[PDB]
Amino acid sequence: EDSFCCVISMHDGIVLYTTPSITDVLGYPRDMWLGRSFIDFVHLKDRATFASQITTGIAKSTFCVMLRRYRGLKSGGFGVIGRPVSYEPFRLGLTFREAPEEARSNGTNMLLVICATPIKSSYKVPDEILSQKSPKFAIRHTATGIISHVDSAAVSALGYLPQDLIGRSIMDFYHHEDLSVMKETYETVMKKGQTAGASFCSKPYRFLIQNGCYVLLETEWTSFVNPWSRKLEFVVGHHRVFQGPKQCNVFEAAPTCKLKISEEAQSRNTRIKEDIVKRLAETVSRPSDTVKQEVSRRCQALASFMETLMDEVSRAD
Amino acid sequence: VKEDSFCCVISMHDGIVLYTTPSITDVLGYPRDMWLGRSFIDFVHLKDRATFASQITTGIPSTFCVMLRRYRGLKPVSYEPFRLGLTFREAPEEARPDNYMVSNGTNMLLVICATPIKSSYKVPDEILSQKSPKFAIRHTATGIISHVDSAAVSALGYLPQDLIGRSIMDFYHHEDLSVMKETYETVMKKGQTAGASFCSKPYRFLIQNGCYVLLETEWTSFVNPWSRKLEFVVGHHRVFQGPKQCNVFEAAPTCKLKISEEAQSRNTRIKEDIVKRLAETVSRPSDTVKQEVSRRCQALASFMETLMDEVSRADLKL
């Protein structure tokens, strides 16, 4: 789309050069960043992720991060009213490249080239319906339900950066009014799990996106089962958003507002979910017609020796 | 010329062995059908199933090492190092059972190609060259190992998963501990200038069996530019002084250490290393004038201008 780049020295960490577009994408003045530390523009919650990338990197992948727009400066701004400091989602692409000598100190002097590009939500009209143009993204959580993988394609549909979701229990994202129609769903991904690779779809369910709204997800479930421990390892859902959200801006701030009732919610559900995990822990079974071939190589090998025994005896003494 | 090994095939359905090369008897000692119908996982040392299963859950729609069990003959239990080569392949329809015809499922088959791994040390205390192997180890700043070149296993009976997790400290000679700290110092003061590296004074390293060796290390490191702390220390080894007994992955648990004011005084030392770095912030003084000169330099400018632009192009519109 419409990106911008910067060259960072990997010695001290300060940006060194910037494409002109820096301004039109993040509102920053042309040479504003030159000399400043790149991290200063990375949301404190994504710095971990960012380090993780330039550490296991020092096809070429991309990750996500919140960058802060330009509004705050030395003088701030005179005239127009203040500035509610904001951050926006960006796809980043790392690229290390050796820095060119300039004259005529063992130790190669590196250079980081970041190319950041804005991530736009994918919902124009409010309750947007499924169009074959809509993104397909997958998510995976473990036996206990903790999510672990999220296709980058999920950010523009749920407004969650991969690292925001991963580590959270898949459950927290289910409509408390649906926990039931869901429990009966997993109860199936498991039955299906009696066949490696077996897949199947389901009736659109409500997923709590970033900004508080809920959506309708079209899912084609799959999972993997340790064929030696015969336990479900992870469940992964291929997704497509069926019915968009209420608030088209996936990244829009989520407004606080919900309801419940202790004795019939803070436990009715906190308990029903508990049964879902346990029911995922239920050791699947994989029958095989080569079990007879085993228990039978037993009796045959035991006797084939039992005989040798009598022989070694009926002949010896 | 390592053509001594055996394969077999597993059904990912139940992990049972469906076939096995005739060699299996040769190399490991089991008769041609001893395994068929068995849970392949039972034949690998407990302390490896992890590494194994893991290598599975990921490579499922490169090599790795494990400890395998030899045939319990008759005239306890024996295990020998093997390098497996997982290969998933699907079965053609004419060969898929009826429980896999009735579903969208998939019938995956594992082609595990086991291969024994002999030590590279034949002559005790050997100090060769071109025939010795070069292998790297990398530990985190708090000192614990994070990666070990496979090319190491044949030079220390340590299977990689035997090192990752433990503190590279342990494998240092209790007597050299001081001189080690003297070098990690160099590592650090060397970290001021990124990229730097340096060979060193051959040191004692504890290999599997219990013997020590001499390591020719060329230390290198990575300092995070932003939060100016050390991210990891990596050492590229070349072993120039072989082991006394040519390790065939045995063991000899008869050690000899000392008391509090001699051992506990060796712990104030290691914990001191974890200190001299871990947090010890690395200096990265940015020269004032250069920054400007280089800023004027119309060459660098255009250089960057392109660089930027070539990345704005590839990584973006592809």
Interface contact A115-B316, CB threshold 8 A: yes
Nearest-Cα distance to chain B for A34, in Å, is 10
Place of tokens 């070349």: B238
In contact, B223 and B282? CB cutoff 8 Å: yes
Q: For B118-285, CATH number? A: 3.30.450.20
C-beta of residue A33 within 8 angstroms of C-beta of residue B245: no
Fold: same for A1-119 and A120-287: yes
B107 contacts in A (CB within 8 Å)? Answer: 196-197
Nearest neighbour of A107 by CB, restricted to B11, B193, B308: B193
Of A17, A102, A106, the CB nearest to B196: A106
**Where chain B is broken, by preceding residue (C–N > 2.5 Å)?**
61, 75
Which segments of chain B are extended strands (E)?
8-11, 17-20, 64-69, 79-84, 88-90, 108-111, 134-140, 145-148, 197-198, 203-206, 212-215, 218-223, 230-241
The DSSP symbol for A165 reads H
Phi and psi at residue A94, to the nearest 5°: -80, 160
Token pair, residue A282, equals 């239920």
Q: Does A285 touch chain B (CB under 8 A)?
A: no
Q: Which CATH number fits domain B1-117: 3.20.20.70, 1.10.620.20, 3.30.450.20, 3.40.50.300?
A: 3.30.450.20
| Domain definitions of chain A by residue range | 1-119, 120-287
- If one counts every other C-beta atom within 10 angstroms of the C-beta of residue B220, the result is 21
Segment 57-116 of chain B within 8 Å of chain A by CB: 57, 60, 97, 99-100, 103-108
**What residues of A are in contact with residue B299 (Cβ under 8 Å)?**
102
Which of A11, A58, A286 lies at the smallest CB-CB distance from B13?
A286
What angle (nearest 5°) sits at the alpha carbon of residue B39, between those of residues B35 and B45? 90
Alpha carbon distance, N-terminus to C-terminus of chain A? 92
Identify the CATH assignment for A1-119 out of 3.40.718.10, 3.30.450.20, 3.30.43.10, 1.20.1050.90.
3.30.450.20
Query: In B, residues 145-164, which contact A (CB 8 Å cutoff)?
Result: none
Cβ contact, residue pair B225, A115, below 8 Å: no
Per the CB < 8 A criterion, the answer to whether A121 and A250 are in contact is yes
Deposited resolution, Å = 3.2
Cβ density class B182-201: b for 16+ within 10 Å, e for less:
ebbeebbebbebbbbbeebe
Are A11 and B303 in contact (CB < 8 Å)? no
Question: Which residue of chain B is at minimal alpha-carbon distance from A235?
Answer: B57
The amino acid at residue A118 is P
**Method for structure elucidation:** X-ray
In B155-302, at which residue ranges do the beta strands (DSSP E only) sit?
197-198, 203-206, 212-215, 218-223, 230-241
Interface of A with B in 206-225 (CB under 8 A): 224
Interface A:B, Cβ pairs < 8 A: 149
CATH 1.10.510.10 fits A120-287, yes or no: no
Q: Is B277 helix (H, G, I), strand (E, B) or coil?
A: coil
Residues from chain B that touch A98, judged by Cβ atoms under 8 A, are none
**Tally of residues, chain A:** 317
Q: Does A51 touch chain B (CB under 8 A)?
A: yes
Using the Cβ of A288 and the Cβ atoms of chain B, whether some distance falls under 8 Å is answered with yes
Fold of B286-318: 1.20.5
- Which of B11, B39, B307 is opposite residue A97, by nearest beta carbon? B307
Residue A230, CA distances (Å) to A38, A54, A67, A191 in order: 48, 38, 44, 13
Give the closest-approach CA distance of A28 to chain B in angstroms. 18
